Each structure stands twice: as structure tokens, then as C-alpha cells.
Structure 1
Amino acid sequence: SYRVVAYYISWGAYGRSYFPSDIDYSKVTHINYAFANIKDGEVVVGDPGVDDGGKNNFTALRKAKKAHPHLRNLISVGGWSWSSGFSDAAATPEARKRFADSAVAFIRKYGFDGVDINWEYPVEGGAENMKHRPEDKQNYTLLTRSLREALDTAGKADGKYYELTTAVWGNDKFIANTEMDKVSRDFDFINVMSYDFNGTWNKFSGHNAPFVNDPAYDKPGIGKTFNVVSAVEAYLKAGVPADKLVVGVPLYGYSWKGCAAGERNGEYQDCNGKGRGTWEDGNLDFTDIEKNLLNKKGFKRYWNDTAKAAYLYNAETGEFVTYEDPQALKIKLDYIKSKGLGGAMYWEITADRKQTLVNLIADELL
């Protein structure tokens, strides 16, 4: 009934040493492979060393399909760092044909069941390398159309339905910059990234995915709609049908160091930059939190009963971790069911080796 949409990261097959063979396929409905890049207006292999060569993640995904006929694997075109190719691809029917045809070619060659458009983001926002024009607002609708048509035609040729999905911003600027009411008709479902609301881009600490607005959080330029319920509600009002709205969830945490304690054990306080991380500073796998920090080694867990968010604080180093606690994830899973939504999505599956969050979502939606 409900979808469970796991992002798998290609670079999992390096240091992390977590491959598609390590996935518990019984615990999901979709795998979105992060990522395919864009080169010359064409969807291309992101990493020949682990995608279609070397560790051969694509082979391993096809082996998984055979074992689990019900499974659907999708290729996620773009991501934070590889979105700069979208503006061009979208802006002419010629370039849109070129793109959509390349995307059909990609999924037939590597045995994928469809495409996830991860464009970050139309009109404005994204990485230092990212490209925009204002016509992205309409062009996003146009590109979606070409893809829908090419996937539908190629689907009919191959005796196969090819899904089309997208990942959309938690910031409602995304909605003012697209036609979600138009483009919602062409997507099988929509992956709402209802996380990255607060991070080390801020000098002060906050929650990565608070459930509702905390008015006690008033640090400069953070919107009262930077929460999970505001974003879902903004996407229902913008025209995303409930049953197509998939709720994003993070399996990583963010950390700062040197956060003043104030009267909130570190919450919404000025800090001294990035805290400890797993694979890089200030970004923690839930596995790392669970095993090494969760009420351990000077880190204590606090609960905000306005936001419905947990955080750790180390009073000694003034380190503050925002992470997805089971207590908050359960409130989000009840919300999904009560609002009639499309299911849960999460970034990303290698970050929870014990499957503590992964099992709670599977057990609640499947």
C-alpha cells in the first residue's frame, strides 16, 4: 500500500564497503541509485569504477531484481553536485528529446525500472557550480513531459512500465519556482526531501528535520516553514496529490563544536563550526551516533516536545548532534498514514547498518 524509497549511494562501494548485496530488499519497495551525471545534455554513468565497471553495483542490482521480482530500481539523475546540466537539457525540445532518449537508453542498458529527476534546484539554490535561468519554472514541466512520453513509448515497445519520479526541496521556494500542480500528473510519485532544514552552513545549531515549527527557534533567516509538516502541507496546497507525496527522512546527523550551552543544552546556540563526523567532519552516520554517542562518552540525549526532535549535547566540547530519533520517526510514520501520503523516502541506506530506523519504517508501512 505505502512506498518505501531507499537512496543507495554509488560511493558506498569504496570506504563504506556497503554494496547492493548488503541491502535488505524485503525492507523497501524502491531503490533510487545516486547518481547518474549529465554530460553534453545526456544522462551518463556517474562512476565507471563502481557503476558499470569495477565493483559492478549495476550487476548486483539486477541480481537483486531476479531475487525480488516486486522490487523497482530507479536511476537518480543529478544530486547536489551534478545538477548544473539540467538548465540546458530543459530549455529546448531538441535538448529535451536528446535528454529523455539518453535516459531511456541508460535504463534499458543497465536494467533499471525508471528515472528519478534530482534537480537541485530550478530557478535558484544549489551548489557553487550550479546553473539557472528563470524559464526553469516552465522548463521543469516541459522536461518532465518529454521523459513521461519517451518512458511510456519505450515502455510499450519493451513490455514494461518505466516509473518517473522526482526529489523536491524542503524549502517552499521550490514551489514558487515550479508548477507542481501541472508536473504532479506526469510523476508516478514525488520524493519530498523533508530534511536539510538546518546544517553547518549555519554558525548556530538547529534540527535537520523538526516535525513542526518551534517558535523558540528564531536565529537569523530561518523560516517558520523549515519543518516536515509545513513542507508536506505546502506540497498538498501546491497540488501534489497525497497518495503521490513520499516523505523524506535522514539516516545521517549533523554536528557542530563549541556550542554555548545557554538554557537549552546547546539547542539554537552559537557554535565554533563543525563537530565530529563519520566520513567527513560535521556529518555522522546514525550507526556512528547509535554505537559511539547516543547517551555515551559525554553526549546526552535531549527531547524538544514542541518540534518533536531529539539532539545530543556534550557539555565538555559543546558538541551538538541533530539526528533522526526513533521517537520522532514514529510521529512521522503516524502522520504519513493519517494524511494518506505515498510512503517514506530516506537518504541514505548505508548510514544505518543496524537497520534501527530502516526496520521501523518497513515494520510500519509494509
Structure 2
Amino acid sequence: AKLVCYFTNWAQYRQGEARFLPKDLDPSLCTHLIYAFAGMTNHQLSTTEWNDETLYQEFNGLKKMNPKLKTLLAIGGWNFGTQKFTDMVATANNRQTFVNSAIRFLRKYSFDGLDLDWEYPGSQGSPAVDKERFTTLVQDLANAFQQEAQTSGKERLLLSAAVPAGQTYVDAGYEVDKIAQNLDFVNLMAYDFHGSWEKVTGHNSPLYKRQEQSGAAASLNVDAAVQQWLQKGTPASKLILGMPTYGRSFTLASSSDTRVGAPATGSGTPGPFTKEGGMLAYYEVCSWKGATKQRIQDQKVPYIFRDNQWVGFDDVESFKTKVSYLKQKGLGGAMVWALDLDDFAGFSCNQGRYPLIQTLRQELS
């Protein structure tokens, strides 16, 4: 099975033991390492950090120590926008120009492929006309890839994509049965089902729902997201169960109603290293002295709380449960966001290096 792990190029700016650079990577940990993120510049693939090209060399240089390892560069992401995408796929010229830069770009820096992270077409200002143009973009990348394979004599560039769980988002711009045919694998983002953008606590990545849920709220969980991807045409071997090494935090209106569904007055206190309210890396959760951990029996994931802080996260156990579930489901593997959010250096949790992802490697392999 596949263990797809994402590296982020902003984790390098974190202070202390949280600073993450390629050297922090374990070559044998995952089967596929994805580099987030690359941007666009005049309909072309481009770097986002003063040192992406140096980082690229260390990233891809890991394949010497592990020749079976596969690397991809992802373009886009949540904070990328849609303009540049909607625009690049508008004319054959731009598509044809993007594609050619993609191939020259990946090869130049030794990437084995490209992971598309257009969040998302047919939404966030994307005319539902982009839904179908996306499909086209896919084939274009696929075709050029299959062709360049022949001419260059090297292995065919891989093509993946980070995809949303939401029925709404899926219908907005994803021709599933079609695009699944051209993607080598699909990175299902089964998280962010809940977060501080809501006025009641809920889990970031629940496997199942709680009895108390039905209707739309019923989909807000992994299994829901998974059936929703299979049913539409995705072959189980190409669907990859994405998992979070981060949880989402809320601030409780009252430190007395600390249950899943309680009143939250907003985001959870920013974490010391991640410094952004409503989210926390697992290593920020780990430590928590004099705190109370619970388990949502229905959704098989935990949560913790101390005073007015409430955070729904993923642990070693819930990860075992999820790999267990994807296995019964016959999914091609697990995807994880992100390497730098796990206690990658055994510096906080006392469970060694990469407690969660090491868990994944073990259960999966």
C-alpha cells in the first residue's frame, strides 16, 4: 500500500524544535513524499520560497538512499485562490504552456510527478464551467505525461490531486468517474469536517458520525467522504485516506460544558509553534499537563480540554483505527498532512520520531 506524506515549505520558519527542513525527513517512512507548495507565474509552474530549488535538491536527493521512494510537487492549496487556475485552463494556449512548464519543471528538479491542489474548481469564485475544464486539464497533463515518457525514456510522470470530502464541493466541480481514470491516485482530504468556523465544538476528523447527527451533518466524517468517492467512480486502489497530524481547537463559552457540541466563543488559543488559532499540531497537543482526554465512541477519535480550551485531534490509536478501516475498504493507502505537524523529532510527545506517521507505516506495511 501507499503512504503519501506532505512536506510544507513554510514549516522551515517555525521556531525551536518545530523548525522543519528536508533534513528532518525520513527517507524510508512513506512511499510517496509530496512537496507543498508550488505556485504559478504567467500560467507556469513556479517556486514560492527563496530556497525551494535548494530544498528540491535535498527532497529529491533522498531517493538515492531510498531508490523506491517517489516524489511529487503539489501546486496550489487552500490559500492559493482560483483565479490563476480558472485562468490557466481557459485557453489551450495556457494549458499547453502550463503542461510544458510542468514537464520541464518536474524533470529539472527530479520530481516524479505533480499533485494538483486546486481548492476548488466550481467554487470559491470558480464558474461551474471550470468543473469540466478541470477534467480537461487532467487529460492534458496525463497525455503529455504519457508522451514525454516515450520521448525522454524515463518513467512516466505521476499525476495526483488533493480532493475535498464535501458532497457540495464534489458536485461543484469534480467529474469523478472521468478524472479518476487519469489520476494515478486520489488524495482524499478527510479532515476539517469541523472547526472554529462553527459555534459548537466538533471533531476535525471523525471516522463515523454521532447518533445525534443526520442529514447533511451526517456526511461530516471520513466513511461518509469515502463512500462518496467510491460511489462516484473512484476505484478503491486509487483512493487514499488522508489523515491529519493536527487537530482543530475551540474556546468553550463555559468550561463546564466540555462535550462534543458545546458552545464555543471562537477559535482555540493559538498554539505556541503553529501560532494560528483553531488549529494545533499533534506535538502541541501531546504535552498538555493537567488536561482531560476523551473518546467519542461513535466517531472513534479523541479530544482534550483544559479550562476553556477544547481541541479535537488524531492520535496513535485513532490512526490505527483509520488504517484498519481503509483496509477493510480496500483503499490504496493513507495520505497524511503533514510531516512537520507530527512530533517528527521526538521532541514533545515522548513516543520517538513521527509517532503518528510511524504508526501508519507499521499498520499499512
Q: Could you state the TM-score of these two structures normalised by the residue count of structure 2? A: 0.91
Aligned-partner Cα distance in 2 for 1:108–1:59? 12
1:262 Cα offset (Å)? 6.0
Corresponding residue of 2:318: 328
Q: Which amino acid aligns with 1:333?
A: V
| Matched residue SS, 1:66 | helix
Alignment of 1:215-230 (within 5 A): 215-217=211-213, 223-230=217-224
Corresponding residue of 1:258: 252
Aligned-partner Cα distance in 2 for 1:97–1:37? 17
Corresponding residue of 1:7: 6
Judge conservation of contact 2:6–2:339 (CA < 8 Å) in 1. Answer: yes
Alignment of 1:146-225 (within 5 A): 146-158=140-152, 159-177=154-172, 178-217=174-213, 223-225=217-219
Aligned partner of 1:31 among 10, 19, 33: 33
Aligned-partner Cα distance in 1 for 2:252–2:229? 37
Aligned-partner Cα distance in 2 for 1:259–1:361? 35
Aligned-partner Cα distance in 1 for 2:304–2:57? 40
Aligned-partner Cα distance in 1 for 2:328–2:274? 37
- Please list the CA deviations of residues 214-241 of structure 1 after superposition, one character each: whole Å capped at 9, or x if unmatched: 13257xx962101000100000001010
Aligned-partner Cα distance in 2 for 1:194–1:62? 27
What RMSD over aligned residues (CA atoms) do the two structures have, in Å? 1.6
Mean CA deviation greater in 326-335 or 66-75: 326-335
Corresponding residue of 2:300: 308
1:186 Cα offset (Å)? 0.4
| Matched residue SS, 2:101 | helix
Judge conservation of contact 1:262–1:269 (CA < 8 Å) in 2. Answer: no
1:50 Cα offset (Å)? 2.4
% same residue = 32
Corresponding residue of 1:128: none
Q: Which amino acid aligns with 2:24?
A: D
Corresponding residue of 2:351: none
- Please list the CA deviations of residues 159-208 of structure 1 after superposition, one character each: whole Å capped at 9, or x if unmatched: 22210000000212232121110111100000000001111111221100
Corresponding residue of 2:284: 288
Aligned partner of 1:139 among 133, 149, 165: 133
Q: Does 1:342 align with 2:332?
A: yes
Judge conservation of contact 1:175–1:238 (CA < 8 Å) in 2. Answer: no
1:326 Cα offset (Å)? 2.0
Aligned partner of 2:55 among 54, 57, 60: 57
Q: Does 1:249 align with 2:243?
A: yes
Judge conservation of contact 2:39–2:48 (CA < 8 Å) in 1. Answer: yes
Judge conservation of contact 2:191–2:204 (CA < 8 Å) in 1. Answer: yes
Aligned-partner Cα distance in 2 for 1:223–1:40? 40
Aligned-partner Cα distance in 2 for 1:60–1:362? 22
Judge conservation of contact 2:146–2:156 (CA < 8 Å) in 1. Answer: yes
Alignment of 1:83-102 (within 5 A): 83-84=81-82, 85-102=84-101
Aligned-partner Cα distance in 1 for 2:321–2:329? 12
Corresponding residue of 2:266: 273
Q: Which amino acid aligns with 2:37?
A: F
Q: Which amino acid aligns with 1:75?
A: L
1:13 Cα offset (Å)? 2.0
Aligned-partner Cα distance in 2 for 1:217–1:329? 23
Judge conservation of contact 1:267–1:320 (CA < 8 Å) in 2. Answer: no
Aligned-partner Cα distance in 2 for 1:18–1:106? 24
| Matched residue SS, 1:154 | helix
| CA 235–283 in structure 1, closer or farther in 2 if over 3 Å, else same | same
Count of equivalent residues: 347
| Matched residue SS, 1:238 | coil
Mean CA deviation greater in 269-278 or 69-78: 269-278
Judge conservation of contact 1:83–1:118 (CA < 8 Å) in 2. Answer: no
Corresponding residue of 2:113: 114
Judge conservation of contact 1:261–1:267 (CA < 8 Å) in 2. Answer: no
Q: Could you state the TM-score of these two structures normalised by the residue count of structure 1? A: 0.91
Gaps of 5+ in 2: 347-353
